[PDB]
Ligand binder design. Sequence first.
Ligand SMILES: COc1cc(C(=O)[O-])ccc1O
Ligand SMILES: COc1cc(C(=O)[O-])ccc1O
Ligand SMILES: COc1cc(C(=O)[O-])ccc1O
Ligand SMILES: COc1cc(C(=O)[O-])ccc1O
Ligand SMILES: COc1cc(C(=O)[O-])ccc1O
Ligand SMILES: [Mn+2]
Ligand SMILES: [Mn+2]
Ligand SMILES: [Mn+2]
Lengths: 335, 335
Amino acid sequence: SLRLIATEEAVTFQPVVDALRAHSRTDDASLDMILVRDVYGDEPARPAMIGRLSDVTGERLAEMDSNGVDMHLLSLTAPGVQMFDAETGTRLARIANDLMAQTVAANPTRFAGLGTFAPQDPASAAREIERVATQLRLNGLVINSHTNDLYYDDPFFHPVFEAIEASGLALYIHPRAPSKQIDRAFRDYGMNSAIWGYGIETSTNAVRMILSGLFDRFPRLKIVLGHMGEAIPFWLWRLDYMHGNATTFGGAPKLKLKPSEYFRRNFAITTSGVESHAALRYSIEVLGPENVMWAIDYPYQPMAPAVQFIRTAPIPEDVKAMVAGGNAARIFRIT
Amino acid sequence: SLRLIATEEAVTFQPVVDALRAHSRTDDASLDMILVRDVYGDEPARPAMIGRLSDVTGERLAEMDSNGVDMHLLSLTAPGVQMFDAETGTRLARIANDLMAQTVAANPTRFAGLGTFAPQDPASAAREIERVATQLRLNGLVINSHTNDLYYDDPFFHPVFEAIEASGLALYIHPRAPSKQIDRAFRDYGMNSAIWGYGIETSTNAVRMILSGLFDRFPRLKIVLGHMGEAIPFWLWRLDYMHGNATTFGGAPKLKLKPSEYFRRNFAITTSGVESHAALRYSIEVLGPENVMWAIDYPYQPMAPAVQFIRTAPIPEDVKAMVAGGNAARIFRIT
Ligand SMILES: COc1cc(C(=O)[O-])ccc1O
Ligand SMILES: COc1cc(C(=O)[O-])ccc1O
Ligand SMILES: COc1cc(C(=O)[O-])ccc1O
Ligand SMILES: COc1cc(C(=O)[O-])ccc1O
Ligand SMILES: COc1cc(C(=O)[O-])ccc1O
Ligand SMILES: [Mn+2]
Ligand SMILES: [Mn+2]
Ligand SMILES: [Mn+2]
């Protein structure tokens, strides 16, 4: 019946797990070290997670079958390879992308894959992006918000976005913990994570990208944001209203379009972790039905409630088909 | 015949203006110094603003009359008295509150008022809050997000919230620029201000308040957030979903209610700066029509579009009356 393609479905591979185990013992002050110790560290607070992330053919497929989920679009879980030094990140990105391709090929009717990269080295990341698109023929790209506590308005990353735009692959900008620029306010009450910091970190990255004019430089970029667009869809009117003040008094560059127009033209969103019919309806209304995709955020969230959320959405069947899988099949080139 | 009570309407008074002019010359590193120099500085980029903020019975009333706006609920404009040292802030809050009460008393069918205080000195602020409630008989309170780069989960401010709860006055937590904990990411593209920083700063403050259990300690507090609730209404499902992880792994304290239940019980929102029928409809649906109030954000925004936004809202007339003014009359003690 309804074709369900879940678009934010995390996976990991042993070489990355091993590298993160080692990294967990270092003095890295990144706020992601909370997650990294909890999942990849010695005496981990979340001991089952590595196994669940690594598994593709056991529990994961069983749960897909029990819930009638056609596909997972897999992505190397945050923080990807971004916490490592440039050489290590670059090496592990290739390894992880090869393993992603192999994972997809073992069950291509049930899995599609996003490749990743190490923007610590923008030139090498650009080469890897090209390899992912043309040599591995993967479905798209994923990166986890900031790299080296810089956001994607920084011209340092222009070679990355040039390659992404040229490749035609959509880039899913997944969260990671608040960067060092903002992490002081996220050290309490678990706010480092999905409950708050993930959304603030990722949305602020994207807003900087828009306001910096990144999408005039690279107008064919396609960006995807989970968690109902990291709430950016809610802020569209205010982003537009206040833009004049930003360019007049704040040194913001003049843009060809309004901020919300970049959001509708260059972005699409997914419903990961936001199983709200009201928020889904709002997003369809302001973005258009072509710009909203379904996701689970497995294994960090369970499949059944995410599935039931979309199966029961109070929207027409044709729009429901678009959200459940049609838009994803287009954006991520899935047949 | 629709009674329009605008709830986020900024004003200033000469003693505060004079103090901010002097403050503008100092080496303060607060991100609010951008606003303060633009408006109160010796060489202001926004030279008309002091006059427009100071004006109550001239341009402001003429514009209210031409647009059929019954009332402004006035508040001392951000950053209030919060940038000053404790003794200066305390004295100026007292003076500004006397001037607010006198302004209101001059035209009490057209103006209501929120008193303010200097949380730099919680014990003195507590006395002033009581005076605002019982002697000046003002309509509520206003404070501008952080004080001293601390948020309102900090036990330092417990005496303030104890007094606010006991007074029965609602506290409008208006924005100011991102605190030093987060300001590094808001130095570009005018993001210090309303376009992005204001919402991130204010929403993060409120989320810390909720997650810290402040509303179990003071369950009768009423908090009001502008800008369509600083987007917290959009995040309710995820805040609730992830709360288990926060209390299990993140050291968040155990709470009597769910995060969204505090938001609906203890908060109400206004539409200042978010003239979106879609966002208004979403907020009414998830918060209830009793929890949404209309505002303009004058003089930072013009009255006519804000008025026309609510007059044309695609909601029933009774709900429209609640949003336009009925809820404000209840929450802010207006006859
Ligand atoms: C590391 O990536 C994630 C982590 C969590 C979490 O920690 O609950 C949730 C969703 C995510 O995709
Ligand atoms: C009419 O202009 C806009 C409308 C909205 C909306 O209501 O969703 C958002 C941004 C805008 O610039
Ligand atoms: C200082 O308070 C505000 C400033 C602005 C601004 O700078 O455009 C807008 C709304 C506010 O209430
Ligand atoms: C002369 O010192 C102060 C005066 C006042 C006042 O006048 O309300 C308030 C606080 C002070 O520290
Ligand atoms: C059913 O539980 C919830 C629903 C919503 C919603 O859909 O607005 C938000 C928070 C919740 O916990
Ligand atoms: Mn995820
Ligand atoms: Mn009164
Ligand atoms: Mn305001």
